CSV table of C-alpha atoms in Angstrom, one decimal:
chain,number,residue,atom,x,y,z
A,5,UNK,CA,-8.1,-24.8,-69.9
A,6,UNK,CA,-11.4,-23.9,-68.4
A,7,UNK,CA,-12.7,-24.9,-64.9
A,8,UNK,CA,-15.5,-24.6,-62.5
A,9,UNK,CA,-15.6,-21.6,-60.1
A,10,UNK,CA,-18.2,-20.3,-57.7
A,11,UNK,CA,-19.7,-20.8,-54.2
A,12,UNK,CA,-21.1,-24.1,-55.3
A,13,UNK,CA,-17.6,-25.5,-54.9
A,14,UNK,CA,-17.4,-24.7,-51.2
A,15,UNK,CA,-17.1,-28.0,-49.4
A,16,UNK,CA,-16.1,-30.0,-52.5
A,17,UNK,CA,-13.1,-32.1,-53.5
A,18,UNK,CA,-12.2,-31.5,-57.2
A,19,UNK,CA,-9.7,-33.6,-59.2
A,20,UNK,CA,-7.2,-32.5,-61.8
A,21,UNK,CA,-10.0,-32.6,-64.5
A,22,UNK,CA,-12.0,-29.9,-62.7
A,23,UNK,CA,-14.6,-32.4,-61.6
A,24,UNK,CA,-16.1,-32.7,-58.1
A,25,UNK,CA,-15.5,-36.2,-56.8
A,26,UNK,CA,-16.3,-35.9,-53.1
A,27,UNK,CA,-17.6,-33.4,-50.5
A,28,UNK,CA,-16.4,-32.7,-47.0
A,29,UNK,CA,-19.3,-30.2,-46.4
A,30,UNK,CA,-22.7,-29.3,-48.1
A,31,UNK,CA,-23.7,-25.7,-48.6
A,32,UNK,CA,-26.9,-23.8,-49.5
A,33,UNK,CA,-25.2,-22.2,-52.5
A,34,UNK,CA,-25.1,-23.9,-55.9
A,35,UNK,CA,-23.4,-21.2,-57.8
A,36,UNK,CA,-21.2,-22.7,-60.5
A,37,UNK,CA,-19.5,-20.5,-63.2
A,38,UNK,CA,-16.7,-21.2,-65.7
A,39,UNK,CA,-13.5,-19.3,-66.0
A,40,UNK,CA,-10.2,-20.2,-67.7
A,41,UNK,CA,-7.4,-21.6,-65.5
A,42,UNK,CA,-4.8,-19.5,-67.3
A,43,UNK,CA,-5.3,-15.8,-66.9
A,44,UNK,CA,-3.1,-12.8,-66.7
A,45,UNK,CA,-1.8,-11.4,-63.4
A,46,UNK,CA,-3.0,-7.9,-62.3
A,47,UNK,CA,-1.1,-5.0,-63.6
A,48,UNK,CA,0.9,-3.1,-60.9
A,49,UNK,CA,-1.7,-0.4,-61.1
A,50,UNK,CA,-4.4,-2.8,-60.0
A,51,UNK,CA,-2.5,-4.3,-57.0
A,52,UNK,CA,-2.8,-2.6,-53.7
A,53,UNK,CA,0.2,-2.2,-51.4
A,54,UNK,CA,0.3,-4.8,-48.7
A,55,UNK,CA,-0.5,-2.8,-45.5
A,56,UNK,CA,-3.0,-4.9,-43.5
A,57,UNK,CA,-2.0,-7.9,-41.4
A,58,UNK,CA,-3.2,-11.4,-42.2
A,59,UNK,CA,-3.6,-12.7,-38.6
A,60,UNK,CA,-2.9,-16.5,-38.3
A,61,UNK,CA,-3.7,-17.0,-34.6
A,62,UNK,CA,-0.2,-18.6,-34.2
A,63,UNK,CA,1.9,-16.7,-31.7
A,64,UNK,CA,5.3,-16.9,-33.3
A,65,UNK,CA,4.1,-15.9,-36.7
A,66,UNK,CA,1.8,-13.0,-35.7
A,67,UNK,CA,4.5,-11.5,-33.4
A,68,UNK,CA,7.8,-12.0,-35.3
A,69,UNK,CA,6.7,-13.0,-38.9
A,70,UNK,CA,3.5,-11.1,-39.3
A,71,UNK,CA,1.8,-11.8,-42.7
A,72,UNK,CA,-0.1,-9.4,-44.8
A,73,UNK,CA,-3.2,-9.7,-46.9
A,74,UNK,CA,-2.0,-10.3,-50.4
A,75,UNK,CA,1.4,-11.6,-49.4
A,76,UNK,CA,3.0,-14.8,-50.7
A,77,UNK,CA,4.7,-16.7,-47.9
A,78,UNK,CA,6.9,-19.8,-48.4
A,79,UNK,CA,7.0,-22.7,-45.9
A,80,UNK,CA,10.3,-24.5,-46.1
A,81,UNK,CA,10.6,-27.8,-44.3
A,82,UNK,CA,12.0,-31.3,-44.6
A,83,UNK,CA,9.4,-34.1,-44.1
A,84,UNK,CA,8.4,-34.6,-41.5
A,85,UNK,CA,8.5,-31.3,-39.7
A,86,UNK,CA,4.7,-31.1,-39.3
A,87,UNK,CA,4.2,-28.9,-42.4
A,88,UNK,CA,0.8,-30.3,-42.9
A,89,UNK,CA,0.0,-29.7,-39.3
A,90,UNK,CA,1.0,-26.1,-39.4
A,91,UNK,CA,-1.2,-25.5,-42.5
A,92,UNK,CA,-4.0,-27.1,-40.5
A,93,UNK,CA,-3.4,-24.4,-37.8
A,94,UNK,CA,-3.2,-21.7,-40.5
A,95,UNK,CA,-6.6,-22.8,-41.8
A,96,UNK,CA,-8.1,-23.3,-38.4
A,97,UNK,CA,-6.9,-20.2,-36.4
A,98,UNK,CA,-6.8,-17.5,-39.1
A,99,UNK,CA,-9.7,-15.4,-40.1
A,100,UNK,CA,-9.8,-15.6,-43.9
A,101,UNK,CA,-13.1,-15.5,-45.8
A,102,UNK,CA,-12.3,-18.5,-48.0
A,103,UNK,CA,-9.6,-21.2,-48.0
A,104,UNK,CA,-8.5,-23.0,-51.2
A,105,UNK,CA,-6.1,-26.0,-50.8
A,106,UNK,CA,-4.3,-27.5,-53.7
A,107,UNK,CA,-2.5,-30.8,-52.9
A,108,UNK,CA,0.0,-31.5,-55.7
A,109,UNK,CA,0.7,-35.0,-56.2
A,110,UNK,CA,1.1,-37.6,-53.4
A,111,UNK,CA,0.7,-41.4,-53.0
A,112,UNK,CA,-3.1,-41.0,-52.4
A,113,UNK,CA,-4.2,-41.7,-48.9
A,114,UNK,CA,-2.6,-38.4,-47.6
A,115,UNK,CA,-5.3,-36.6,-49.6
A,116,UNK,CA,-7.9,-38.6,-47.6
A,117,UNK,CA,-6.2,-37.4,-44.4
A,118,UNK,CA,-6.9,-33.8,-45.5
A,119,UNK,CA,-10.5,-34.5,-46.5
A,120,UNK,CA,-11.0,-36.3,-43.2
A,121,UNK,CA,-9.6,-33.3,-41.3
A,122,UNK,CA,-11.7,-30.9,-43.4
A,123,UNK,CA,-14.8,-33.0,-42.6
A,124,UNK,CA,-14.3,-32.2,-38.9
A,125,UNK,CA,-13.0,-28.7,-39.4
A,126,UNK,CA,-14.7,-25.5,-38.2
A,127,UNK,CA,-13.9,-24.0,-41.6
A,128,UNK,CA,-15.6,-26.7,-43.7
A,129,UNK,CA,-18.1,-24.4,-45.3
A,130,UNK,CA,-15.4,-21.9,-46.3
A,131,UNK,CA,-13.0,-24.4,-48.0
A,132,UNK,CA,-12.4,-25.9,-51.4
A,133,UNK,CA,-9.8,-28.7,-52.0
A,134,UNK,CA,-8.1,-29.4,-55.3
A,135,UNK,CA,-6.0,-32.6,-55.5
A,136,UNK,CA,-3.8,-34.6,-57.8
A,137,UNK,CA,-2.4,-37.9,-56.8
A,138,UNK,CA,0.7,-39.9,-58.0
A,139,UNK,CA,-1.5,-41.9,-60.4
A,140,UNK,CA,-2.3,-38.7,-62.3
A,141,UNK,CA,0.0,-37.5,-65.1
A,142,UNK,CA,2.5,-34.7,-64.8
A,143,UNK,CA,0.3,-32.4,-66.9
A,144,UNK,CA,-2.7,-33.1,-64.6
A,145,UNK,CA,-0.6,-32.4,-61.5
A,146,UNK,CA,0.3,-29.0,-62.9
A,147,UNK,CA,-3.3,-28.2,-63.8
A,148,UNK,CA,-4.2,-28.8,-60.1
A,149,UNK,CA,-2.2,-25.6,-59.1
A,150,UNK,CA,-3.9,-23.5,-61.8
A,151,UNK,CA,-7.4,-24.8,-60.9
A,152,UNK,CA,-6.8,-24.0,-57.2
A,153,UNK,CA,-5.5,-20.6,-58.2
A,154,UNK,CA,-8.3,-19.9,-60.6
A,155,UNK,CA,-10.9,-20.9,-58.0
A,156,UNK,CA,-9.2,-18.6,-55.5
A,157,UNK,CA,-9.0,-15.8,-58.1
A,158,UNK,CA,-12.8,-15.9,-58.6
A,159,UNK,CA,-13.5,-15.5,-54.9
A,160,UNK,CA,-11.0,-12.6,-54.8
A,161,UNK,CA,-12.9,-10.8,-57.6
A,162,UNK,CA,-16.1,-11.2,-55.5
A,163,UNK,CA,-14.4,-9.2,-52.7
A,164,UNK,CA,-13.5,-12.1,-50.4
A,165,UNK,CA,-10.4,-12.4,-48.3
A,166,UNK,CA,-9.0,-15.7,-49.7
A,167,UNK,CA,-6.2,-17.8,-48.4
A,168,UNK,CA,-4.5,-20.2,-50.9
A,169,UNK,CA,-2.4,-23.2,-50.0
A,170,UNK,CA,-0.3,-25.0,-52.6
A,171,UNK,CA,1.4,-28.2,-51.3
A,172,UNK,CA,3.7,-28.6,-52.7
A,173,UNK,CA,5.8,-26.4,-55.0
A,174,UNK,CA,8.4,-29.1,-54.8
A,175,UNK,CA,6.2,-31.8,-56.4
A,176,UNK,CA,4.7,-29.3,-58.7
A,177,UNK,CA,8.2,-28.6,-60.0
A,178,UNK,CA,8.8,-32.4,-60.3
A,179,UNK,CA,5.7,-32.7,-62.6
A,180,UNK,CA,6.5,-29.4,-64.3
A,181,UNK,CA,10.0,-30.7,-65.1
A,182,UNK,CA,8.4,-33.9,-66.4
A,183,UNK,CA,6.1,-31.8,-68.7
A,184,UNK,CA,9.2,-30.0,-70.1
A,185,UNK,CA,10.5,-33.3,-71.5
A,186,UNK,CA,7.3,-33.5,-73.7
A,197,UNK,CA,9.3,-17.8,-76.3
A,198,UNK,CA,7.7,-20.1,-73.7
A,199,UNK,CA,9.6,-22.7,-71.7
A,200,UNK,CA,7.7,-25.1,-69.5
A,201,UNK,CA,10.0,-24.2,-66.6
A,202,UNK,CA,8.9,-20.5,-66.4
A,203,UNK,CA,5.2,-21.3,-65.6
A,204,UNK,CA,6.4,-21.5,-62.0
A,205,UNK,CA,6.9,-17.7,-61.4
A,206,UNK,CA,3.8,-16.8,-63.4
A,207,UNK,CA,1.8,-19.1,-61.1
A,208,UNK,CA,3.1,-17.4,-58.0
A,209,UNK,CA,2.6,-13.9,-59.4
A,210,UNK,CA,-1.2,-14.2,-59.3
A,211,UNK,CA,-1.8,-13.7,-55.6
A,212,UNK,CA,-2.1,-10.3,-54.0
A,213,UNK,CA,-4.6,-7.7,-52.9
A,214,UNK,CA,-6.5,-5.9,-55.7
A,215,UNK,CA,-7.6,-2.3,-55.3
A,216,UNK,CA,-11.0,-3.2,-57.0
A,217,UNK,CA,-11.5,-6.5,-55.2
A,218,UNK,CA,-10.5,-8.8,-52.4
A,219,UNK,CA,-7.1,-10.5,-51.7
A,220,UNK,CA,-5.4,-13.9,-52.1
A,221,UNK,CA,-2.9,-14.6,-49.3
A,222,UNK,CA,-0.9,-17.6,-50.6
A,223,UNK,CA,1.2,-20.2,-48.7
A,224,UNK,CA,3.5,-22.4,-50.8
A,225,UNK,CA,5.3,-25.4,-49.3
A,226,UNK,CA,8.8,-26.3,-50.3
A,227,UNK,CA,10.3,-29.7,-49.3
A,228,UNK,CA,13.9,-29.5,-48.2
A,229,UNK,CA,16.8,-32.0,-48.4
A,234,UNK,CA,18.6,-26.9,-49.4
A,235,UNK,CA,17.2,-27.6,-52.8
A,236,UNK,CA,18.2,-25.5,-55.9
A,237,UNK,CA,14.4,-24.9,-56.3
A,238,UNK,CA,14.3,-23.5,-52.7
A,239,UNK,CA,16.8,-20.8,-53.6
A,240,UNK,CA,14.9,-19.9,-56.8
A,241,UNK,CA,11.5,-19.6,-55.0
A,242,UNK,CA,12.7,-17.7,-51.9
A,243,UNK,CA,13.8,-14.8,-54.1
A,244,UNK,CA,10.4,-14.6,-55.7
A,245,UNK,CA,8.2,-14.6,-52.6
A,246,UNK,CA,7.6,-12.0,-49.9
A,247,UNK,CA,9.3,-14.0,-47.3
A,248,UNK,CA,9.6,-17.6,-45.9
A,249,UNK,CA,8.9,-19.7,-42.8
A,250,UNK,CA,11.6,-22.2,-42.0
A,251,UNK,CA,10.7,-25.2,-39.9
A,252,UNK,CA,13.9,-26.6,-38.4
A,253,UNK,CA,14.5,-30.4,-38.3
A,254,UNK,CA,16.2,-29.9,-34.9
A,255,UNK,CA,13.5,-27.9,-33.3
A,256,UNK,CA,11.0,-30.6,-34.1
A,257,UNK,CA,13.0,-33.5,-32.5
A,258,UNK,CA,13.4,-31.5,-29.3
A,259,UNK,CA,9.6,-31.1,-28.8
A,260,UNK,CA,9.1,-27.5,-29.9
A,261,UNK,CA,5.9,-27.2,-32.0
A,262,UNK,CA,5.5,-25.3,-34.2
A,263,UNK,CA,9.1,-26.1,-35.1
A,264,UNK,CA,9.5,-22.6,-36.6
A,265,UNK,CA,13.0,-21.2,-36.4
A,266,UNK,CA,12.1,-17.5,-36.0
A,267,UNK,CA,15.8,-16.4,-36.5
A,268,UNK,CA,15.9,-18.0,-40.0
A,269,UNK,CA,12.4,-16.9,-41.0
A,270,UNK,CA,11.3,-13.5,-42.2
A,271,UNK,CA,8.3,-11.6,-43.5
A,272,UNK,CA,9.5,-8.9,-45.8
A,273,UNK,CA,6.2,-6.9,-45.3
A,274,UNK,CA,6.6,-7.1,-41.5
A,275,UNK,CA,7.2,-3.3,-40.9
A,276,UNK,CA,4.4,-2.3,-43.3
A,277,UNK,CA,1.8,-4.4,-41.5
A,278,UNK,CA,2.5,-3.8,-37.8
A,279,UNK,CA,2.8,-0.6,-35.8
A,280,UNK,CA,5.8,0.8,-34.0
A,281,UNK,CA,5.3,-0.6,-30.5
A,282,UNK,CA,4.9,-4.0,-32.1
A,283,UNK,CA,8.2,-3.4,-34.0
A,284,UNK,CA,10.0,-2.5,-30.8
A,285,UNK,CA,8.7,-5.6,-28.9
A,286,UNK,CA,9.6,-7.9,-31.8
A,287,UNK,CA,13.1,-6.4,-32.1
A,288,UNK,CA,13.6,-6.9,-28.3
A,289,UNK,CA,12.4,-10.5,-28.6
A,290,UNK,CA,14.6,-11.3,-31.5
A,291,UNK,CA,17.7,-10.2,-29.5
A,292,UNK,CA,16.5,-12.2,-26.6
A,293,UNK,CA,16.2,-15.3,-28.8
A,294,UNK,CA,19.6,-14.7,-30.3
A,295,UNK,CA,21.2,-14.4,-26.9
A,296,UNK,CA,19.4,-17.5,-25.8
A,297,UNK,CA,20.8,-19.4,-28.8
A,298,UNK,CA,24.2,-17.9,-28.1
A,299,UNK,CA,24.0,-19.1,-24.5
A,300,UNK,CA,22.9,-22.6,-25.5
A,301,UNK,CA,26.3,-23.2,-27.3
A,302,UNK,CA,28.1,-21.9,-24.1
A,303,UNK,CA,26.2,-24.5,-22.1
A,304,UNK,CA,26.9,-27.3,-24.5
A,305,UNK,CA,30.6,-26.2,-24.4
A,306,UNK,CA,30.5,-26.6,-20.7
A,307,UNK,CA,31.5,-22.9,-20.0
A,308,UNK,CA,28.3,-21.9,-18.2
A,309,UNK,CA,28.4,-21.8,-14.3
A,310,UNK,CA,25.7,-20.1,-12.3
A,311,UNK,CA,26.8,-17.0,-10.5
A,312,UNK,CA,29.6,-16.4,-12.9
A,313,UNK,CA,27.9,-13.9,-15.1
A,314,UNK,CA,24.8,-12.0,-14.0
A,315,UNK,CA,23.9,-11.3,-17.6
A,316,UNK,CA,24.1,-15.0,-18.5
A,317,UNK,CA,22.1,-15.8,-15.4
A,318,UNK,CA,19.2,-13.5,-16.5
A,319,UNK,CA,19.1,-14.9,-20.0
A,320,UNK,CA,19.2,-18.5,-18.5
A,321,UNK,CA,16.2,-17.7,-16.3
A,322,UNK,CA,14.2,-16.6,-19.3
A,323,UNK,CA,14.7,-19.8,-21.3
A,324,UNK,CA,11.5,-21.3,-19.8
A,325,UNK,CA,9.3,-18.2,-20.5
A,326,UNK,CA,10.6,-17.9,-24.1
A,327,UNK,CA,10.0,-21.6,-25.0
A,328,UNK,CA,6.5,-21.4,-23.5
A,329,UNK,CA,5.7,-18.4,-25.7
A,330,UNK,CA,7.1,-20.1,-28.8
A,331,UNK,CA,5.3,-23.5,-28.4
A,332,UNK,CA,1.6,-23.7,-29.2
A,333,UNK,CA,-1.0,-26.5,-28.9
A,334,UNK,CA,-2.2,-27.2,-32.5
A,335,UNK,CA,-5.8,-27.0,-31.4
A,336,UNK,CA,-5.4,-23.4,-29.9
A,337,UNK,CA,-5.4,-20.0,-31.6
A,338,UNK,CA,-4.5,-16.7,-30.1
A,339,UNK,CA,-5.8,-13.2,-30.9
A,340,UNK,CA,-3.4,-10.4,-31.8
A,341,UNK,CA,-4.1,-8.7,-28.4
A,342,UNK,CA,-3.3,-11.9,-26.5
A,343,UNK,CA,-0.1,-12.4,-28.5
A,344,UNK,CA,1.2,-8.9,-27.9
A,345,UNK,CA,0.2,-9.3,-24.2
A,346,UNK,CA,2.1,-12.6,-23.9
A,347,UNK,CA,5.2,-11.4,-25.7
A,348,UNK,CA,5.4,-8.4,-23.5
A,349,UNK,CA,5.4,-10.5,-20.3
A,350,UNK,CA,8.2,-12.6,-22.0
A,351,UNK,CA,10.2,-9.4,-22.7
A,352,UNK,CA,10.1,-7.4,-19.5
């Protein structure tokens, strides 16, 4: 009900009891304070309107699904669509002040995969990991989300630009449903948990990414109406070699037009229509109706398939600045 916070947790691996059990980085600071894991969300008068972009360094996101500082973004995918690998990119290529990762419960060794990555990450001294594994009880798996959120909330109060990762909301809901078997329902602690991120007028911001495991869950329909948008990673795009396997046409950022300017909006609108006509031509090709020289309009969209796919794909080890992204999407568009 109370947990450790502070800069002394940077580089530490904390378990569902709030105790540091491992370290992926050692830092000068030893600041350790104590705050409750349950605290009230900011009143509407304390939240600032989302108006500044949270750049991720990922071309498809920053151009067509631009995030904002304080936004809550869902990541919907069926295992395995590289949802952990996209989060690694989001940590590695963004420019947040502090990253807080909460792994809700797994078998066990996947947690070590993340601590092994963090041990070799360039963001090691700006990261805190909270975990809960399948051995831990359903109450402990729930507390992992609140500890990760409370740790992120302290850094926001200090004025930091914080990025929070909860993986996953799916398995949090599993444990949360298990707790319900044991005015207030257990079930409705889910929306209160996701209401805490945001940019505060008197402090920093918490940009939160929640993962949802798919195989069209009822929970997916519940959470997608709560968040400020969602990123959909298509099974099919993954098997055809497109990484990140993000389907831009079924993903949205509801703060998109508040966080990008007008020439960006125009280029994104022109690119979305190009993508839609590309997908519409694919089905014509599979139907065996496409013949070169038949339709000059179809021929032009066909000759842009390669330039569009090259813009969409991205090496997981490479990040792009916003200027580079808008420069590349313009060459794809004209």
